[PDB]
Point group: C3
Chain length 336, copies 3
């Protein structure tokens, strides 16, 4: 496509929504190729990641951890206006694993506080992909400070299983998993810092142990529980998009399954089926499609149970509906 043909394409401005929600979109593409426009302001901010009050000097796209999920269709163009407010102190940029060239866009988006840039790339490959900041000299630090998210490039024809049959979800949720490495003092207590820079040296030491102090969904322990628990109903089809820009994870829906799982996150790669626990490597996004068959509370976790229950990697799904005794029933309740 020439610059003229591209400039002639229709454009649609999209308003991003905070994770785990996803902005309105059409599973099946509307018309031909479009230039989808997104805008994100980078915010360096202090966030609390657990009930104890542990602090992290986050570097958040659109002000959230993970950054929001941008959705486009294959062969559409994603035009991102990225802003780094003069209130920030570090240089930032963005790298789309979905894009091709200049380190995923990182080599063309280096912006200092008080600057902005607009990047456009053709979404040539369908699937879910990770995106993260990557400043030459402190890549891992920025990413484990929460500066990452994901995008979804849907086939123009929507989703299908490995045999041509359509897969249409009723709901979609984006679970961004984050590994945090918070310094501790001699008492084993998490340390606090005045500015993000102050924590760098101590943090790097923790990072080198390759042992995160916290592994959380949506920026904090329990962030997707209670009133923030995700929801569904028996019969409802749900697509759960999951990303981890730095460390491996192994998603598992307790009480359920991944009926169709694109574990590698790429739609032209047939999804695995009837999965109990799938695997997403650090630096990637994956997606699972499931039709709920039983009501009740479900937990969605990274299945290294220590990471799930001791480190923070557990979310909840509240599901309404009629219980199915054929699928499961208590013949004899706990009794003497």
């Amino acid at each position: 496509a020439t610059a003229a043909e591209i400039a002639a394409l229709p454009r649609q401005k999209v308003e991003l929504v905070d994770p785990p929600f996803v902005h309105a979109h059409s599973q099946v593409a509307e018309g031909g190729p479009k230039v989808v426009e997104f805008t994100m302001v980078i915010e360096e901010k202090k966030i609390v990641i657990d009930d104890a009050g542990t602090e992290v000097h986050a570097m958040a796209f659109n002000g959230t951890v993970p950054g929001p999920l941008m959705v486009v269709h294959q062969d559409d163009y994603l035009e991102l206006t990225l802003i780094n407010p003069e209130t920030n102190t570090l240089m930032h940029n963005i790298n789309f694993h979905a894009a091709t060239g200049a380190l995923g866009g990182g080599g063309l988006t280096e912006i200092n506080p008080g600057e902005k840039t607009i990047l456009r790339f053709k979404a040539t490959k369908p699937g879910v992909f990770v995106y993260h900041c990557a400043p030459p000299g402190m890549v891992p630090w920025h990413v484990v400070s929460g500066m990452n998210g994901a995008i979804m490039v849907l086939p123009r024809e929507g989703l299908h299983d490995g045999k041509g049959k359509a897969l249409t979800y009723d709901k979609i949720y984006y679970v961004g998993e984050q590994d945090f490495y918070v310094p501790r003092d001699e008492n084993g207590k998490y340390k606090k810092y005045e500015a993000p820079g102050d924590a760098y040296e101590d943090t790097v030491k923790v990072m080198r142990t390759l042992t995160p102090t916290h592994v959380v969904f949506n920026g904090a322990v329990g962030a997707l529980t209670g009133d923030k628990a995700m929801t569904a109903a028996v019969g409802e089809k749900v697509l759960i998009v999951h990303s981890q820009a730095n460390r491996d994870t192994r998603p598992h829906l307790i009480g359920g399954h991944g009926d169709y799982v694109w574990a590698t996150g790429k739609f032209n790669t047939p999804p695995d089926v009837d999965q109990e626990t799938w695997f997403i490597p650090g630096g990637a996004a994956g997606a699972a499609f499931y039709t709920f068959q039983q009501p009740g509370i479900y937990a969605y976790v990274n299945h290294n149970l220590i990471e799930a229950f001791e480190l923070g990697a557990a979310a909840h799904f509240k599901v309404t509906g009629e219980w199915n005794d054929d699928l499961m029933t208590s013949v004899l309740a706990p009794s003497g």
Copy 2:
């Protein structure tokens, strides 16, 4: 199926056998759907896991670590009678990754010492699946104390390769891999405790490092080596079911391969072929099919060689038969 149709289904009691062995079963289903009945008594007991007398207060389904392998066919019902003797001191339950609803059955099987419960679930998805105890608030602890196992839900038509060609094994083994986190004193000696709960705090501290002190098969270092090595003969087709309820593993048959490997452990997902080393994520089970071609001793290991030879993740296969010089031969034996 109607209420009457389900109640009319044949009920069959099956006696379990200890791992790595598997109870008698047929690969191709014999007759229509059945309600297969199993009973397991829970045992809390101290076990030694290495040659240094290191102890673990194990929580074992049916008295073994891993728990035994239950085998049923797709659409059969698995009805488990779970017993927690008055001699035990902890609460227990069971979570079947193969089941649908109530956290895999955990929310319906919480039993205190002196109680029993009967759970029935329809095995709707074919594959090998992990099962483990999962008491709200103490999941990882009981799981890494050995309270986990697996089940195999065979297709009613038996196993087949990605092309539809049947795969019939002559024998089957179940290797359950366990990550243990044993506390050590300031001198580096593993500590001993009077009761399970006494070790809780120290153990959780070790668990948080995400670094197991031991990684073993069948509950102890060397449990499947020497005189307890598994066996086979040249020409024999063997299915090796492998599980890890909490941590990733990478099985490898030294000297052999995984001719067909359902790495995700699910039969409707085509198996990978000619595998050197496969990957099973924590929270799942997988299965490898291999036809032995050469006689001799083979080592079956988790291929992070430190976990295999330093931590204990190594088993052996003793194979009888005639050597094949076409496949391999020493043209010049070691010499000056």
Copy 3:
């Protein structure tokens, strides 16, 4: 084939080249089955792995880390002459994951300093496979000292996608990833030893932590950058073979993708497509096929960014050619 039939097969002597380059070969088999001959001399030498002068007493096949990549075709016979110089002090052998029998050849190739041996095996399974030393009693040690490599067993008819379409690469590179566990003194400084055996004890304690001090490509930090960066040009098809003999890895081409990826490294297992980041379990090799579309410098890393940018797992690709504004363009360059 009988002994006589094999002895009648044509032989071909191959000259090995140092990684990341691969010795001359043909993608499509040039003629019928033959006995491909290779010779490697084991070199026990000191190598500096980082810019801090950190040393490792390496055990290297053919004098390099990783060992060179041997290329044959399915059903050819690989005849390796392994030599252990009198100048060496340790016992060595070789285990081919691609071979069938005697622990992959390790039980037939044990050679003391001043000895040699000739092993011949039939490459019956197509794909990339790991090969490494495995001295009963100290396995993990030699392997994590750099004594491992890989070989490639191409289909007779060359490479194909999942649908049978031919995949012909213009260039091929072999990246051997290595996890090192270097002991430190009480000041956190890496220690040096005058003899290999001298570091054994100290090394074993670091290995127990399952936390490498270094994770590198081709034996050292920055080894595959600058004067050793891999090259290509827009439109060129490149196959990137990657192996890890002891620990998991998740390769990612920054700015690009893995158009076709045999993640398990086995050719009869259909490759995944449009990959952002793939996964290779410790004890295996994988291969990715990509056609560069953009010029510029690309980074190739193990996508646990701490491992890549802090521990050393990073390589570079220098690509010449013209920039493609359709795929990516900076609508608005960084500005006020």
